[PDB]
Design a protein around this ligand. Structure first.
Ligand SMILES: Nc1nc2c(ncn2[C@@H]2O[C@H](COP(=O)(O)OP(=O)(O)OP(=O)(O)O)[C@@H](O)[C@H]2O)c(=O)[nH]1
Ligand SMILES: Nc1nc2c(ncn2[C@@H]2O[C@H](COP(=O)(O)OP(=O)(O)OP(=O)(O)O)[C@@H](O)[C@H]2O)c(=O)[nH]1
Ligand SMILES: Nc1nc2c(ncn2[C@@H]2O[C@H](COP(=O)(O)OP(=O)(O)OP(=O)(O)O)[C@@H](O)[C@H]2O)c(=O)[nH]1
Ligand SMILES: Nc1nc2c(ncn2[C@@H]2O[C@H](COP(=O)(O)OP(=O)(O)OP(=O)(O)O)[C@@H](O)[C@H]2O)c(=O)[nH]1
Ligand SMILES: Nc1nc2c(ncn2[C@@H]2O[C@H](COP(=O)(O)OP(=O)(O)OP(=O)(O)O)[C@@H](O)[C@H]2O)c(=O)[nH]1
Ligand SMILES: Nc1nc2c(ncn2[C@@H]2O[C@H](COP(=O)(O)OP(=O)(O)OP(=O)(O)O)[C@@H](O)[C@H]2O)c(=O)[nH]1
Ligand SMILES: Nc1nc2c(ncn2[C@@H]2O[C@H](COP(=O)(O)OP(=O)(O)OP(=O)(O)O)[C@@H](O)[C@H]2O)c(=O)[nH]1
Ligand SMILES: Nc1ncnc2c1ncn2[C@@H]1O[C@H](COP(=O)(O)OP(=O)(O)OP(=O)(O)O)[C@@H](O)[C@H]1O
Ligand SMILES: Nc1ncnc2c1ncn2[C@@H]1O[C@H](COP(=O)(O)OP(=O)(O)OP(=O)(O)O)[C@@H](O)[C@H]1O
Ligand SMILES: Nc1ncnc2c1ncn2[C@@H]1O[C@H](COP(=O)(O)OP(=O)(O)OP(=O)(O)O)[C@@H](O)[C@H]1O
Ligand SMILES: Nc1ncnc2c1ncn2[C@@H]1O[C@H](COP(=O)(O)OP(=O)(O)OP(=O)(O)O)[C@@H](O)[C@H]1O
Ligand SMILES: Nc1ncnc2c1ncn2[C@@H]1O[C@H](COP(=O)(O)OP(=O)(O)OP(=O)(O)O)[C@@H](O)[C@H]1O
Ligand SMILES: Nc1ncnc2c1ncn2[C@@H]1O[C@H](COP(=O)(O)OP(=O)(O)OP(=O)(O)O)[C@@H](O)[C@H]1O
Ligand SMILES: Nc1ncnc2c1ncn2[C@@H]1O[C@H](COP(=O)(O)OP(=O)(O)OP(=O)(O)O)[C@@H](O)[C@H]1O
Ligand SMILES: [Mg+2]
Ligand SMILES: [Mg+2]
Ligand SMILES: [Mg+2]
Ligand SMILES: [Mg+2]
Ligand SMILES: [Mg+2]
Ligand SMILES: [Mg+2]
Ligand SMILES: [Mg+2]
Lengths: 221, 220, 222, 221, 221, 221, 222
């Protein structure tokens, strides 16, 4: 049998497609959803999980909903004032993606997973966590823990229509069946330099969270 | 005896094709494509019950497959331009191609390599039942090592031929199928147009096969 | 108390907001969804109905899902070849809107409703059924049957964001919880002249369907 | 409030449409199906009755399935040899329609109905019971018992397509959801003269059956 | 332990007795009833089957009720006009017995039976299918398929009383617990020559039905 | 409106038809079956009662199965030796009909019935209880108790076929769904003179049984 | 029976005590909790409501948990960048309080309540949203809608110990059984002028939300 991989899953179109495409290849998927504690109307997600189980059966090996609110708070919210004053951009959703990755190190090590997959896309590159500089940074971070971070729909998705009509071909809804962050439409577009600087500044906190989650320290960075 | 697949609508001809295979001792997997534009499909279940009562375990399954996405990609996405350029509504030809693309994937995943339909000689005005379309689709399936057969094609010189064989099996003569909303929505195309449309759409059909196999995301 | 009105409801953002806005005013709403027979993955609709019932209670007086496939076929599909060749645009979704309105005449007359509401929007004016020429044609058509056809979010909705964040303020999801037409992204943009010509051409069929649905004739349009 | 009428109902397209059209007008309909005893695969009928009840509710006031095998035998089968030798045509299905009408006199009188309706059509006039001469004959027969016999789709239905598309507009299947007579495709086309002569010859039997069903005689014609 | 044989069973007296007599000998019996689609009031049959199961237990190895309406129609009804004009006799019940025999070839071959038995009787020889010429024709037809067709009460039954009082001695009702054909009392008596000519004319249709039922052809004669 | 009448009912064709014909006229019928204690295989009767209830509903007002074995014994069996030696005919079934009539006087008087009906027929006049002389005798006997004894199918039934095909027209089986007397086919045909002499000889016993059943005496005739 | 009042209720000690003290007087209370959508570990709240129902029975006339996430987003999150750059302080929780008040106008008007009560105390001095300048502003806002805003434990509660010992005398836990906001006041003091400027800037949004919730407009603030 083929080793299960993890998919960072929102119920949105792109992460649904990434999971489906792996399953089409015979790769079992563990769906993993991060609840940051600032996400609204997540109930529709269960409709999407049912669609995926109906289409792929046992290749959906599980769905973990993880509470990442504390890590998210430590990285992105506790120093929000200072962060916004320094970078002049609201980067909390970049912080969220880093909090996700910290939690994923711990999850992967405790559940014998070493490939993680997301649904970032080329056409969404205005979003900081989907920029090449962020993806490269997070690939490097995961590689330090021997975790392979892949983005299987990144290059294919030149528009939302590309993702939608592949889903439709699988007999799955084209709608985005996800919760929304309260931070939706709460930010302007940051430069690549700012994205990378924020990631570098917060990285010590992220690694520290990894170490705490592993039971290796209580002390701060 | 290795099970074979029948493309099954509940209609008279596909019912008879399945029955005739079962009479020979061949188990049949009934496969129905739901294109997403079919009305009043509920009566199908009466036909499946008739067939199970008459043939028992030789009916090895009934899959109802959602093929709406492939149908849309092949036949509906470019409907405006397709009708303007060929001057014929060929969506039901596109549907049959979408069916065949799905059947490649289904056959490969379920260890089937003979598929069967109920196209008939007397229905040759319909594009997917013309010899040029049948030949094209046989060739397409053969490229995937699938044998596509049409066991009532030559026998059925009229609807009456099919009906009275069904009656001899103790099965109703009625057509217990849903209808396409595209019923009576087209004029008759030439063979050249049918074949041109099939050749134009074939790369998309093969691409759908490849996506369904998990081999690519990219367009043709 | 206040007389119930009907909302043409998909589960989408705009028709959700139109229904909610009426209910906020104390107007009970009968939700009406047309199943044209060519719509995919409608199951999510029920999530939206539940959200609306949780937020508004008994002001949601009902949800009718009507099979309009035969009227849709007669208006928009049966002569698809000819229609596309003549107008050089695929107008089936305009035909669908007309089929909806024909069914709504019959529904309103049989259920004591005389105001119908939709969620068409200004920002979606590229779509033929949402253009002012279509809206005003259909307003006039409904008025000839003593039905008031209104579009309560039409002028407010200068973008999808306007509709979304009003829904969010009601504690309702911002997502479009609707099925999709198979005819999604199957057409190019028609002129206003074409939209109006198509509506005028098909109107006699629509009226004939109204008459049949009322039990008044079997005969086809003259 | 409006007096119920009867519809001679097979589950076929035309009688379905006749019943539906009456109901659209606010007329409640009692569906009546004659089982001649020679009808095959009648099971599908119940799908159609369900469709009609779903579309029209309480306007469908009932469905009677009547055993008319004995009347059918007496009129059309018992003297089959002589009938075919004399007329050189198999007219059993004309006899069946007469047997239906005899039963309907009794049914109407016992159930307070005085309008009956069928789904004969113009485009099916090759069939003996649908010819104008047969319709006229049976109208006259019913009128002698103060019963109004109407054919509400007769003139409209210039083809099967006319009936089908009206059904589809009602959200009802276009298929013919009826049993078939074993006598399907068992006859050649009779002349009008033969149709009328057969009806006149069998009429005394039909009236006698009416009288027996009313409890008025045991004796033969 | 003894090989099961088939009995052509109506619930009538003679086929009941034939089945019982075989079972008294230790021969298990598969009861087979052909429903032509034109037979009335068949419900009473189940009373007889219960009587037989109570008297003989496991020697009744089953009861198949076969729908033979399509074969019956093809052989006897479809060309009724021509058949009656040519022979000047209604021979549908002879056609029915041929349709039964066609179905029995297929049933015997698929269920490992090679002896079939009926309850034709000497005293019923006015009926075409019970004449010696019909019996010998059908014996020959069955023999071509390696099926032995026997009539175990044929010679014993010089009157109905002979059959009745043997049944009574078994603790079984003397009544004929069978349906009737609508074609009851619908025919005059044919000559032996006509019976044989009809059987010879219809035989190709019967054999073709055998071939279709075996899955060997679709084509007509 | 209409007063219920009684029908002497066996489940046989003629008594079934008599009851049905009364019900067709709007006369409710109380079915009454006499069990003499020497009748076999009576279970099939219940199929017939069900047919009648299905066809006529509430017009079947009841079915009494009466144990008349003691009256039958006293009239017809106790002096069987003497009776047969004197008349040279086994007349037990005539005795049975007299026992029935004695019981019917008591039943009618206790249940407010004053018209009784049977299914004796012209074509069965070889049977002693169906001869004109027996019918006349029993009419006179019943008239002495103010009971009207009628035979509504007596004159109509010139053959079994007359009865059968009227039943078929009602949607009822043509079979005789009755038990049989063990005394079936146990007698030769008596003269009218013998029938009448036997009836006159046994009448005092029958009247005495009437008186005992009324509670008016214990003493013998 | 006496007219029910509302208590702005967190499950914390002070708003618990305020509600209890009103109920001791025979005043029925509707407990109302605003869920911003960014509050964590709110499950313990139900333990507190149960304690209160056990102690006071039918004087607890309900507990509404209102989803105010959309109003909160519109007021305090959507323009976070601009808000922080202009005022140089994170005032999200002040924005939250304004969103609460907007929702309270709508709730009070639809449930026939005209007195609301909170658990403000003397010892609650740290937070900008607890300053007298904010309270005065919000009292004035409620008064414009004829709603009386009262603070029944304000003068008694010179420290948290004062509140705790009264709760204990009622047989209720002294713990703060509430969720926490993911947000938290940063070290700087803003000036009163800044607090009031923020409130005045956001007030038009808040009133517009009130008007939308009443079914009176769809249009944005003006
Ligand atoms: N950084 C970041 N922001 C996102 C992302 N997705 C959404 N957002 C923000 O949230 C807003 C609303 O997102 P959605 O609810 O998905 O908006 P939408 O695309 O109109 O809606 P759907 O079609 O239902 O997905 C966007 O306009 C962004 O401000 C993401 O992947 N990254
Ligand atoms: N291309 C194509 N069109 C078909 C096919 N079958 C039906 N149609 C179309 O659909 C119409 C109606 O189909 P059916 O409902 O099967 O028609 P029918 O068998 O003539 O009659 P009904 O069963 O009573 O409706 C036809 O007239 C065609 O326009 C088919 O196999 N291929
Ligand atoms: N005429 C018409 N076409 C529409 C309408 N809505 C959608 N379409 C068509 O369908 C396509 C996809 O619509 P949606 O699936 O609603 O768009 P989306 O933003 O991907 O998804 P949603 O979140 O469901 O709104 C559009 O690009 C149009 O081609 C409408 O109101 N009228
Ligand atoms: N006299 C008479 N014969 C009929 C009538 N309807 C059908 N038949 C006969 O029965 C045959 C078959 O009837 P159907 O099975 O309904 O024929 P069909 O409409 O071609 O069959 P489908 O399309 O499968 O529904 C006809 O060809 C006629 O011989 C009728 O109303 N009157
Ligand atoms: N060809 C043929 N006709 C039969 C046969 N059995 C019965 N019939 C016909 O059906 C008619 C009546 O059948 P039954 O009701 O069984 O005859 P019956 O002897 O009056 O009735 P029961 O004693 O009640 O069984 C006969 O008069 C014949 O016309 C048979 O074996 N062959
Ligand atoms: N006296 C008298 N004897 C009868 C009567 N009916 C039947 N029997 C006797 O009982 C015998 C058998 O009756 P049934 O079993 O009804 O005989 P059947 O009517 O010839 O034929 P089946 O109904 O097929 O048995 C007759 O032959 C008579 O001896 C009757 O009404 N009166
Ligand atoms: N000796 C001792 N006293 C304690 C301890 N924890 C709390 N207390 C005291 O007990 C009293 C009430 O305890 P708590 O309710 O825990 O104190 P608190 O400040 O309310 O704490 P929280 O309710 O957790 O915010 C106070 O007067 C505290 O001084 C402990 O571990 N040891
Ligand atoms: N809370 C979360 N938990 C898990 N994965 C997440 C979360 N938030 C974001 N991601 C990952 O980030 C990717 C990018 O998000 P994005 O919104 O662009 O895609 P999506 O939600 O899959 O699709 P859609 O375009 O419909 O929103 C997601 O595909 C997912 O893999
Ligand atoms: N949706 C579908 N799914 C599967 N097979 C299909 C589908 N549509 C058509 N086919 C195939 O195409 C053949 C031709 O269709 P056609 O309508 O002529 O036949 P039918 O439905 O079997 O019979 P009928 O004459 O009653 O309609 C069918 O017999 C069937 O094998
Ligand atoms: N099948 C249908 N049944 C009923 N009303 C419909 C149907 N299709 C469209 N409508 C009406 O027309 C409008 C179509 O416009 P549009 O699709 O933009 O709106 P929506 O579905 O409410 O929102 P969204 O932008 O989320 O799709 C709907 O708001 C609704 O009022
Ligand atoms: N057994 C029956 N019971 C009642 N009415 C009958 C019966 N047989 C025929 N009819 C009447 O005769 C009419 C003509 O029959 P015909 O078969 O043409 O119509 P249909 O069955 O309604 O439609 P279809 O064309 O689908 O068969 C029927 O509509 C019905 O009213
Ligand atoms: N439909 C049928 N299915 C099976 N066997 C049949 C059928 N019709 C006739 N037969 C056979 O042919 C014979 C017909 O003769 P007949 O009807 O006289 O006999 P029966 O029904 O057994 O007795 P009865 O004299 O009581 O009717 C039956 O005994 C039976 O073996
Ligand atoms: N045991 C009985 N109980 C009641 N009535 C009886 C009884 N025996 C005979 N009769 C009456 O006398 C008649 C006897 O005549 P016969 O037996 O011929 O009639 P049947 O049983 O009705 O019909 P069949 O001819 O089928 O036997 C019956 O019709 C019935 O009215
Ligand atoms: N989300 C909210 N919903 C309703 N009222 C609230 C909310 N947040 C704050 N308040 C009001 O403002 C006060 C906030 O101050 P504080 O947190 O000291 O009070 P508390 O929650 O009652 O007590 P504590 O938090 O110390 O247990 C509450 O007493 C309450 O009246
Ligand atoms: Mg997303
Ligand atoms: Mg078909
Ligand atoms: Mg929409
Ligand atoms: Mg019909
Ligand atoms: Mg028999
Ligand atoms: Mg009898
Ligand atoms: Mg607090």
């Amino acid at each position: 049998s083929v080793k299960p991989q993890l998919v960072m899953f929102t119920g949105g179109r792109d992460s649904t497609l990434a999971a489906c495409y792996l399953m089409l290849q015979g790769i079992p998927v563990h769906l993993w959803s991060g609840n940051s504690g600032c996400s609204l109307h997540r109930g529709i997600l269960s409709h999407r999980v049912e669609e995926m189980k109906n289409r792929f059966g046992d290749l959906v090996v599980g769905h973990t909903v993880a509470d990442i609110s504390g890590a998210f708070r430590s990285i992105a919210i506790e120093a929000l004032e200072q962060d916004i004053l320094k970078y002049r951009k609201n980067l909390v959703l970049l912080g969220e993606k880093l909090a996700i990755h910290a939690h994923l190190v711990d999850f992967c090590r405790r559940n014998d997973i070493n490939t993680i997959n997301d649904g970032i896309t080329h056409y969404q590159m205005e979003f900081p966590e989907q920029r090449l500089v962020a993806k490269t940074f997070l690939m490097e971070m995961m590689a330090q823990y021997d975790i392979n971070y892949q983005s299987p729909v990144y290059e294919f998705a030149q528009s939302a229509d590309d993702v939608k009509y592949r889903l439709l071909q699988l007999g799955i809804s084209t709608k985005s069946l996800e919760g929304i962050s309260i931070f939706a439409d709460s930010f302007s577009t940051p430069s690549d330099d700012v994205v990378l600087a924020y990631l570098r500044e917060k990285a010590p906190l992220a690694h520290n969270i990894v170490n705490f989650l592993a039971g290796e320290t209580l002390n701060p960075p």
